[PDB]
Amino acid sequence: ADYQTIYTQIQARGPHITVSGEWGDNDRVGKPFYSYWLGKIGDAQIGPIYLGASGIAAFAFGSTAILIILFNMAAEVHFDPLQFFRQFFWLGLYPPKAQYGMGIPPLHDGGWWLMAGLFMTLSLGSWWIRVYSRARALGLGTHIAWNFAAAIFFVLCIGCIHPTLVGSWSEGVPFGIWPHIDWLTAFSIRYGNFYYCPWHGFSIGFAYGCGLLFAAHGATILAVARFGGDREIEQITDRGTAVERAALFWRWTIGFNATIESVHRWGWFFSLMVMVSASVGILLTGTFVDNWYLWCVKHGAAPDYPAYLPATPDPASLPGAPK
Amino acid sequence: CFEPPPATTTQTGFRGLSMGEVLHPATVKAKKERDAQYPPALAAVKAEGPPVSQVYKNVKVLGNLTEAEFLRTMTAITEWVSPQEGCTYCHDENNLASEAKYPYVVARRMLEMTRAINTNWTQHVAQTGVTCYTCHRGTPLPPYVRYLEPTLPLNNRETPTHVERVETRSGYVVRLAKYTAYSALNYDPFTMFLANDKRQVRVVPQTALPLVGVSRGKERRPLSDAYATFALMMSISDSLGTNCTFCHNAQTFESWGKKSTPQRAIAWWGIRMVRDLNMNYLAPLNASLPASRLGRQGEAPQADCRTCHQGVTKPLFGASRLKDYPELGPIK
Amino acid sequence: ALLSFERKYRVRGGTLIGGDLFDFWVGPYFVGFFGVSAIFFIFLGVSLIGYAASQGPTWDPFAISINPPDLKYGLGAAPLLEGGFWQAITVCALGAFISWMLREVEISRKLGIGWHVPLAFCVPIFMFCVLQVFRPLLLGSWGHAFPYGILSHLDWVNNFGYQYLNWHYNPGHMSSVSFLFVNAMALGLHGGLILSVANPGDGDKVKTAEHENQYFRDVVGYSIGALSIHRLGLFLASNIFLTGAFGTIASGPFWTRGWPEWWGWWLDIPFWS
Amino acid sequence: MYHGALAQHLDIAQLVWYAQWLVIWTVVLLYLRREDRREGYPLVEPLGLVKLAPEDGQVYELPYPKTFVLPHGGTVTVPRRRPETRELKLAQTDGFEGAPLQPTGNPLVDAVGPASYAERAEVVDATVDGKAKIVPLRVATDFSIAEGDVDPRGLPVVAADGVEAGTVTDLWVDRSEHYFRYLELSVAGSARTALIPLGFCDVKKDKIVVTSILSEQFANVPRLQSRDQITLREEDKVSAYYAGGLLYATPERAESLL
Ligand code: BCB
Ligand code: BCB
Ligand code: BCB
Ligand SMILES: C/C=C1/c2cc3[nH]c4c(c3C)C(=O)[C@H](C(=O)OC)c4c3nc(cc4[nH]c(cc(n2)[C@@H]1C)c(C(C)=O)c4C)[C@@H](C)[C@@H]3CCC(=O)OC/C=C(/C)CCC[C@H](C)CCC[C@H](C)CCCC(C)C
Ligand SMILES: C/C=C1/c2cc3[nH]c4c(c3C)C(=O)[C@H](C(=O)OC)c4c3nc(cc4[nH]c(cc(n2)[C@@H]1C)c(C(C)=O)c4C)[C@@H](C)[C@@H]3CCC(=O)OC/C=C(\C)CCC[C@H](C)CCC[C@H](C)CCCC(C)C
Ligand SMILES: CC(C)=CCC/C(C)=C/CC/C(C)=C/CC/C(C)=C/CC/C(C)=C/CC/C(C)=C/CC/C(C)=C/CC1=C(C)C(=O)c2ccccc2C1=O
Ligand code: HEC
Ligand code: HEC
Ligand code: HEC
Ligand code: HEC
Ligand SMILES: CC(C)=CCC/C(C)=C/C=C/C(C)=C/C=C/C(C)=C/C=C\C=C(C)\C=C\C=C(/C)CC/C=C(/C)CCCC(C)C
Ligand SMILES: CCCCCCCCCCCC[N+](C)(C)[O-]
Ligand SMILES: CCCCCCCCCCCC[N+](C)(C)[O-]
Ligand SMILES: CCCCCCCCCCCC[N+](C)(C)[O-]
Ligand SMILES: [Fe+3]
């Protein structure tokens, strides 16, 4: 077996490299240090970190959002520190419970939620600028930023775009561990079972495919690490036996194959499509479809099944039944 | 952390749909033994003599019974409601027609309520019916009642923690969670849905596309109604010791016909019956109760699904005393 | 027929069974003995699906559903129309999947590469067994397994979840979901990164390994490195099912209540109760 | 009336369903599957004789060429014509189209099958700032073994047959990634040096075990041009040599394990 694919047997140390960027080389703070146990399964060097304007703006806005959330959470346990740790998972900051439409809600019923939403959104935009500009500063393409953009766009969809399209802030995602989980069922119940939303299906198809692709790609590179397949950039520009064997393994298995470069386009595309499909689904939901199951029945797609115990009429529609 | 196998499972939908009950035998046995404490029927007595309307002085509900029949009732009532306290719980030792103790007047209304249940709500209690025991289980205060705010523990026979106490505000989220099967849902399904008939449980649209005029802005129900319905369903499931598939094919929670079991219809009647009981029999009794029975808003204790069911899909696993005590209903 | 670089790799040997008898290609496809068994099982399973589907109500692909037997048949054979076809198809599936895996190890040996890919492919085969074999064994019926249909298998996932009131609170599920999410995120990052170095645009020159690490050190203060991200990605993806299988096996055999209630081990410690 | 309704039983969501499939198949078929073909295409047939005109599908399946501007000068364009020139010492075991080839000589030296190397540039891989990337420690003197880990320098190398075959004299390190990739070893009784990819090395505290080749086979490991640097093609030649041993070191390794 190739033990190098499991962990680094003999680690190496050397002077720390610094690639210069078009700006901000002085905003790298911290002194690098080395972790021997990290170095078994990764690169041993931790830090320094770049510390630009957008990154600080992100930390500023983020912490503001975190603080607004934590304070409202603590209010929910009347500031008892012990119950706060006990009940942490169950605590939350909720959008309005009452229907104000799109009017700004009272602070006690969703205003603080809206506030925390604003500052998180600013934090996401600020970090996006960091992710984008750091690439151009180092003379790299902006591929990560465009993937990250789709992920931010999906959050905005469930956070505020879908609420504004249907016209009620009551539909946003709460802040908190269990409560953001509870939203998923409330939403799916409201809109007629999300299994029958084709864009749920698409998103899941791509999410599962990301698991398929990264398992397959990761396994492939490790299987050709003896020929240096991990050095992918130079295998793109000068095809070595590593990527020839990787390409032929798949070709002989499934009948076709990618290149060392194109496999990353596949992976990038699949990842992006998780978020793009999710967003189309949310954008259609509530605006143009009210019950995804009935929409599938309307178009003849839903499965049906025999009764097992007897079919049961809606009692509310029998004559003389109470309301 | 975990419950050792095997599990008992049942089937409630077409094969391949994963519908049905999942039960831990130990737990079922412990509930079976708790419920087997149901006292057996007192021996039948011969109907003899005049109606007790002519014999006793203050008999307004049970007036058509004979003396032995009526005293048999009174023995059964004491066994079901106040066995440890005895007949003197409701009566003055020296004047059995005195209404001076509040349990007397309450018991009279409870008699009317119980026969109402067995006569007007057969759509829910069928031929099984209820007795005083179904709720009370041998104590004057039933172990599973609800106030207009959640209380812990669920069984009022256990002693509350400082945090469990309703006046400790830091314990509200936990009081609420334990009523909704430990979910973080931020809604009290009892005051929302079971205390009165003001709210609609259904939230799911019955059309594929959104209907213009109910689908935008303030025309829309807030999403919180869906959280609230879900919370009601968590609470209902936990109260019967069962899961959603007992009543629903989760393919379409809102559909009836093949998508619902007959138990879902019975449950629907149960919601209406509990509303009738609370609005018309139990909530008015804050006039007749001491202040130590009332909640922080002067409300009487009221009933939910757990009051009768106590964690079993049929109260007391289907035990019945209807044929043994005709005077409790149904009434022609 | 052949890629420009392929011929020098197309050598004899590396099989596990049969030696020369099946050591050949058909078009791009390597065959081998497990190539043959795979096609056998695929042909058998697809036949049974077709025969079973024709005895059913519809031909709409979204509505076809081959279902397991009623629970009352326990672990026994069930009549073909009411569960038997499901039983037969399931065995063909396992035959096909395992054949496919073993075929990949043969291809791996011939090329002189690691067996990591069939190894990784064991994880989803294992998960399939958890759902269709192991958990139904532990509960005592094939009836607890999921049905074969595009949309019907979602109805089973659906009801299965709601049998425990809110499946999201299943701790094995929480772990599984977290790996699904971070895996999809890492693959975007890894693919994004590689493309960004090889394709800076504008006729600018392609960058370097050191540029790769500089980028992530700058943005998040750490860079795991080229070889390591591939190890991590296999680890992340594999743990979607490796941890998930516990949350699945637990539900029913080792837990019968709702999954929210399970967290009482934390909430109900007397110290802060 | 209904949000999202259109005339004649159409709704918007139904249209988006079609559009979404169209987008997917467009990207997969017209973009990704052509990107997949920037290597190894056009394919090779039993002699493509039509030198006068290309067959239509071969033009259609290819993307427009792209040019990489290399970091230390030069350009690479893909796809491009790159036939494999060198004579392969293989013979067809049958007349069938996809019958396997057999090695006629010694497949490790002849560099066929798992021993094949790619025809990469006879060029030394470079650091960001132009230095040689893969260098032995005698040259890379500011690099050390990390404290904790076996220093293999001095340890013996045991081959598959259990025979000591040489002694590890140096580690080659990747200066770009801070990662050791090869051990250098003197092959006992042959007055030469050989490189070994770490991935073929079982690093124990008293020995380096190497199961891919026999002790005698260390004699014909591809040699380098220079002592203190390596070219990309040499890296391929060296790595491939041991991988070829997995199938060829003994007659029994190519036959079925069962
Ligand atoms: C425990 C939970 C499970 C689950 C939960 C689930 C959900 C919630 C959703 C799906 C969806 C899907 N699932 Mg399903 N599922 C599927 C297959 C499918 C596809 C129909 C679809 C998209 C899959 C995908 O893109 O993956 C990534 C793989 C890729 C991209 C490679 C391509 C695979 C190809 C598209 C699959 C096509 C398979 C054929 C339709 C079936 C084979 C037919 C035979 C005759 C050849 C198979 C083959 C299995 C097996 C063998 O176990 C399986 C098990 C499960 N699914 C478990 C039961 N799955 C989605 C859907 O839209 O269903 C309608 C969906 O929303
Ligand atoms: C009962 C309810 C269910 C439900 C309800 C549901 C809803 C309501 C929605 C989904 C959605 C999705 N569901 Mg689904 N679901 C899924 C899978 C999925 C995802 C693939 C998809 C997209 C979500 C995502 O990736 O977010 C992970 C990624 C996120 C959230 C992006 C975050 C990026 C952000 C930049 C991160 C930054 C954070 C900051 C650093 C932190 C700062 C915080 C501080 C300041 C507070 C599977 C595999 C199954 C199975 C097996 O049954 C399933 C069943 C269910 N879902 C049931 C049907 N699901 C979404 C969808 O696709 O709808 C069409 C969706 O909207
Ligand atoms: C109401 C019910 C829900 C539910 C019920 C549920 C259940 C009951 C189970 C899961 C499980 C899982 N859920 Mg969950 N879920 C998930 C995500 C997930 C997955 C990560 C995880 C594993 C799925 C699996 O086993 O695939 C299975 C995939 C397999 C087996 C692939 C087999 C492939 C095979 C080897 C090859 C197939 C070959 C083809 C036939 C060949 C054809 C190819 C063609 C192209 C030639 C998300 C992201 C969400 C969100 C966003 O809400 C969600 C919500 C829900 N889940 C709802 C709350 N979910 C599973 C889990 O791990 O739980 C802990 C699980 O058992
Ligand atoms: C399919 C597409 C997937 C996808 C894609 C992508 N996702 C990306 C990118 C892409 C392309 C980036 O380029 C960017 C990034 O930068 O990566 C390195 C990023 C992000 N996705 C994060 C979280 C996330 N993605 C989720 C999901 C999906 N994403 C879906 C699945 C989910 C889920 C599932 O809920 C979560 C929680 C953060 C790590 C990060 C934003 C931080 C932020 O917006 O600041 C917000 C400001 C703060 C102050 C928050 C502070 C804490 C966080 C953890 C940040 C701490 C970092 C700090 C450097 C620590 C110092 C350590 C040092 C001392 C040693
Ligand atoms: C965490 C680990 C991840 C992971 C990993 C890997 N995945 C791999 C590899 C690795 C490493 C490969 O090396 C191998 C491959 O070659 O890649 C191209 C492979 C593959 N992953 C496939 C599907 C896949 N991966 C999924 C998930 C993950 N993978 C997770 C995420 C999912 C879902 C649902 O998520 C799907 C659908 C096939 C494309 C391919 C097998 C082909 C096959 O097996 O041929 C043999 C079988 C056939 C060609 C058809 C057989 C038909 C049977 C007999 C009759 C049908 C019965 C069937 C049960 C009916 C179902 C109906 C349905 C509607 C319910
Ligand atoms: C008729 C007959 C007798 C035949 C005998 C021969 C025989 C056994 C034939 C088999 C016939 C069968 C069953 C064919 C079916 C083939 C199958 C299962 C195809 C599935 C294809 C699918 C859907 C794959 C999903 C994954 C996906 C999107 C892949 C696209 C990208 C690719 C090609 C990834 C593979 C791939 C990865 C993962 C790399 O890392 C890598 C690194 C460097 C170079 C190349 C690659 C590479 O090609
Ligand atoms: C509360 C739950 C009671 C207990 C315990 C007992 N009794 Fe009772 N009794 C109760 C009520 C509400 C009434 C009025 C009934 C009506 O139909 O209006 C009665 C009535 C009687 C009577 C008739 C008295 C009279 O009006 O003259 C008798 C003789 C009587 N009760 C006796 C009795 C005995 C012996 C009990 C213990 C076995 C007993 N009662 C318990 C309420 C309650
Ligand atoms: C559930 C549907 C009930 C049935 C059936 C019966 N009772 Fe009841 N009772 C119920 C509640 C929720 C309450 C309020 C809590 C309380 O303690 O008041 C009561 C109350 C009483 C009382 C008053 C006891 C006290 O407050 O100390 C009495 C005397 C009583 N109930 C008697 C009684 C009898 C005789 C019943 C059968 C005819 C009966 N109850 C049925 C709930 C339910
Ligand atoms: C039987 C004892 C039930 C169990 C267990 C669960 N539900 Fe239920 N549900 C039940 C009824 C009788 C009704 C109708 C209520 C009415 O007053 O009309 C409902 C309703 C729902 C709905 C709303 C459907 C709609 O038309 O909008 C939902 C979404 C729902 N139920 C979900 C649900 C879930 C998730 C459950 C397990 C947690 C569950 N129900 C259990 C009866 C019963
Ligand atoms: C006492 C007054 C009750 C209250 C309050 C509720 N239920 Fe009930 N239920 C009661 C009886 C006596 C029976 C009959 C048992 C029998 O053998 O038929 C029932 C039955 C049900 C069922 C049927 C279960 C079955 O296995 O067929 C269901 C689903 C049910 N009850 C649900 C239910 C709900 C949701 C309630 C709160 C709204 C509820 N019940 C209250 C007695 C009483
Ligand atoms: C014009 C103005 C007035 C209105 C528009 C404002 C606007 C743009 C609002 C947008 C709001 C949005 C996008 C809301 C979206 C909210 C979403 C998706 C929330 C989702 C999940 C939240 C979670 C899980 C938060 C949990 C909170 C905590 C755990 C407490 C915070 C503490 C932490 C340490 C955070 C850790 C989070 C994680 C890394 C573990
Ligand atoms: C919507 C996000 C707004 C955030 C504003 C704060 C970010 C400042 C951006 C500074 C970028 C400077 N630059 C281009 C040289 O990197
Ligand atoms: C996971 C959900 C998938 C459900 C797929 C249903 C798509 C229906 C699209 C119908 C196309 C329109 N038409 C005319 C053919 O009915
Ligand atoms: C539900 C998500 C759909 C994902 C579709 C991706 C499938 C890849 C198809 C590969 C096609 C192969 N080939 C050679 C025919 O082009
Ligand atoms: Fe890669």
Where exactly are the structural domains of chain C? 1-165, 166-273
Q: Which two tokens stand for residue C102?
A: 């073993």
Q: Alpha-carbon distance B107 to B140, whole Å?
A: 10
User: Cβ contact (<8 Å) for B212 and D3?
Assistant: yes
Specify the residue for token string 């099912």: C241
- Can you list the alpha helix ranges (DSSP code H) found in C199-267? 209-220, 226-250, 259-262, 264-267
What distance in Å separates residue A301's CA from the closest CA in chain C? Answer: 6
User: Cβ contact (<8 Å) for D40 and C4?
Assistant: yes
Residue B139 CA: distances (Å) to CA of B83, B104, B135, B301, B302: 7, 15, 9, 14, 16
Asked if residue A48 has a cis previous peptide bond (ω within 30° of 0), the answer is yes
Architecture of domain D2-119: Irregular (4.10)
**Residue D116: which of A234, A241, A261 has the nearest Cβ?**
A241
Q: Alpha-carbon distance A159 to A183, whole Å?
A: 11
User: Cβ contact (<8 Å) for D3 and B215?
Assistant: yes
Cβ contacts (< 8 Å) between A89 and chain B: which residues? 184
Pocket of ligand 13 (CB under 6 A): A 196, 198, 200-201, 296, 299-301; C 62; D 14, 17
**What DSSP line would sit under D176-237, residue for residue?**
TTTEEEEEEEEETTTTEEEEEEGGG-EE-SS-EE--SS-SGGGGGSPPPSSSS--BHHHHHH
User: Cβ contact (<8 Å) for C156 and B183?
Assistant: no
Beta bridge partners of D91: D102
CA R_g for chain B? 22
Cβ contacts (< 8 Å) between B220 and chain A: which residues? 99, 166-168
Question: Is the CB of residue D130 less than 8 Å away from at least one CB of chain A?
Answer: no
Q: Point out the ligand nearest to the CA of residue C230.
A: 15
Q: Which two tokens stand for residue D52?
A: 């006068």
Domain boundaries in chain A? Answer: 1-143, 144-302
Query: Collapsing DSSP states into helix, strand and coil, what is residue A147?
Result: helix
End-to-end Cα distance, chain D: 71
Pocket test for ligand 13, best of C62, C64, C158 (most atoms within 8 A of CB): C62
Any ligand 6 atom below 6 A from CB of A224: no
Any ligand 8 atom below 6 A from CB of B142: yes
Write the DSSP symbol of residue D124: B
| b/e C125-138 (16+ beta carbons within 10 angstroms → b) | bebbebbbeebbee
Q: Resolution of the coordinates in A? A: 2.8
Asked if residues B318 and B128 have their Cβ atoms less than 8 Å apart, the reply is yes
**Residue A288: which of D3, D150, D235 has the nearest Cβ?**
D3
Any ligand 9 atom below 6 A from CB of B236: yes
Query: Collapsing DSSP states into helix, strand and coil, what is residue A6?
Result: coil
Nearest chain C alpha carbon to B249: C159
**Residue B205: which of A79, A102, A291 has the nearest Cβ?**
A291
Per the entry, the structure determination technique was X-ray
Please tell me which chains touch C, using 3 or more CB pairs under 8 Å as the contact test. Answer: A, B, D
Chain pair A-B, CB pairs under 8 angstroms: 171
Please tell me which chains touch A, using 3 or more CB pairs under 8 Å as the contact test. Answer: B, C, D
Q: Alpha-carbon distance C178 to A148, whole Å?
A: 18
Is B132 known to sit in a ligand binding site? yes
Q: Which of B114, B127, B232 is nearest to B181 (CA)?
A: B232
Q: Alpha-carbon distance A4 to C228, whole Å?
A: 10
Residue B19 CA: distances (Å) to CA of A144, C151, C161, D67: 44, 16, 10, 59
Q: Which two tokens stand for residue C32?
A: 């081998």
User: Cβ contact (<8 Å) for A47 and C191?
Assistant: no
Q: How many Cβ atoms from other residues are within 10 Å of residue D109's Cβ?
A: 15
Q: Point out the ligand nearest to the CA of residue C104.
A: 5
Question: Is the CB of residue A295 less than 8 Å away from at least one CB of chain D?
Answer: yes
Q: Alpha-carbon distance A225 to D188, whole Å?
A: 28
Q: Alpha-carbon distance B145 to B150, whole Å?
A: 10
Q: Alpha-carbon distance A209 to A263, whole Å?
A: 13
Question: Is the CB of residue A143 less than 8 Å away from at least one CB of chain D?
Answer: no
Any ligand 6 atom below 6 A from CB of C102: no
Question: Is the CB of residue C143 less than 8 Å away from at least one CB of chain A?
Answer: no
Asked if residues D244 and D115 have their Cβ atoms less than 8 Å apart, the reply is yes
Nearest CA residue ID for atom 40, ligand 11: A177
Q: Torsions phi, psi of A206, nearest 5? A: -75, -40
Q: Alpha-carbon distance D151 to A148, whole Å?
A: 43
Q: Alpha-carbon distance A54 to A128, whole Å?
A: 8
Nearest chain D alpha carbon to B211: D2
Chain pair A-C, CB pairs under 8 angstroms: 300
Query: Collapsing DSSP states into helix, strand and coil, what is residue B145?
Result: coil
Asked if residues A13 and A34 have their Cβ atoms less than 8 Å apart, the reply is yes
Write the DSSP symbol of residue A89: G
Question: Is the CB of residue D128 less than 8 Å away from at least one CB of chain C?
Answer: yes
Q: Alpha-carbon distance B170 to B190, whole Å?
A: 21
Cβ contacts (< 8 Å) between B212 and chain D: which residues? 1-3
Domain D120-258 has CATH 3.20.20.370: no
Query: Collapsing DSSP states into helix, strand and coil, what is residue B49?
Result: coil
The Å distance, Cα C61 to ligand 9 centre, comes to 30
Residues, chain D: 258
Asked if residue B6 has a cis previous peptide bond (ω within 30° of 0), the answer is yes
Q: Residue B176: how many CA atoms within 13 Å on its side-chain side?
A: 22
Cβ contacts (< 8 Å) between B209 and chain D: which residues? 2-5, 11
Nearest CA residue ID for atom 22, ligand 7: B96
Q: Alpha-carbon distance B38 to B320, whole Å?
A: 10
Nearest CA residue ID for atom 9, ligand 2: A184
**Residue B5: which of C70, C138, C164 has the nearest Cβ?**
C138
Query: What is the position in ligand 11's atom list of the atom closest to the CA of A174?
Result: 19
Which residues of C are known binding-site members for (7R,8Z)-bacteriochlorophyll b?
Answer: 153, 173
Asked if residues A224 and A243 have their Cβ atoms less than 8 Å apart, the reply is yes
User: Cβ contact (<8 Å) for C26 and D98?
Assistant: yes
Question: Is the CB of residue D98 less than 8 Å away from at least one CB of chain C?
Answer: yes
Question: Is the CB of residue D251 less than 8 Å away from at least one CB of chain C?
Answer: no
Contacts of A234 (CB under 8 A, 6+ apart): A240, D125, D232
Asked if residues A42 and A230 have their Cβ atoms less than 8 Å apart, the reply is no
Contacts of D87 (CB under 8 A, 6+ apart): none
User: Cβ contact (<8 Å) for C191 and A271?
Assistant: yes
As annotated, the residues of chain D forming the CATH 4.10.540.10 domain(s) are 2-119
Residue C267 CA: distances (Å) to CA of A84, A88, A165, C173, D96: 11, 10, 39, 20, 70
The Å distance, Cα C65 to ligand 1 centre, comes to 14
Discontinuities in chain B (C→N > 2.5 Å), after residue:
none
What distance in Å separates residue B253's CA from the closest CA in chain A? Answer: 8
User: Cβ contact (<8 Å) for D236 and A202?
Assistant: no
Query: What is the position in ligand 1's atom list of the atom closest to the CA of C153?
Result: 58
Q: Alpha-carbon distance A111 to B142, whole Å?
A: 42
Beta bridge partners of A175: A93
Burial of residue B42 (number of CB atoms within 10 Å: 0-12, 13-18, 19+): middle
Q: How many Cβ atoms from other residues are within 10 Å of residue B26's Cβ?
A: 11
Any ligand 9 atom below 6 A from CB of B199: no
Asked if residues A178 and A92 have their Cβ atoms less than 8 Å apart, the reply is yes
User: Cβ contact (<8 Å) for D16 and A257?
Assistant: no
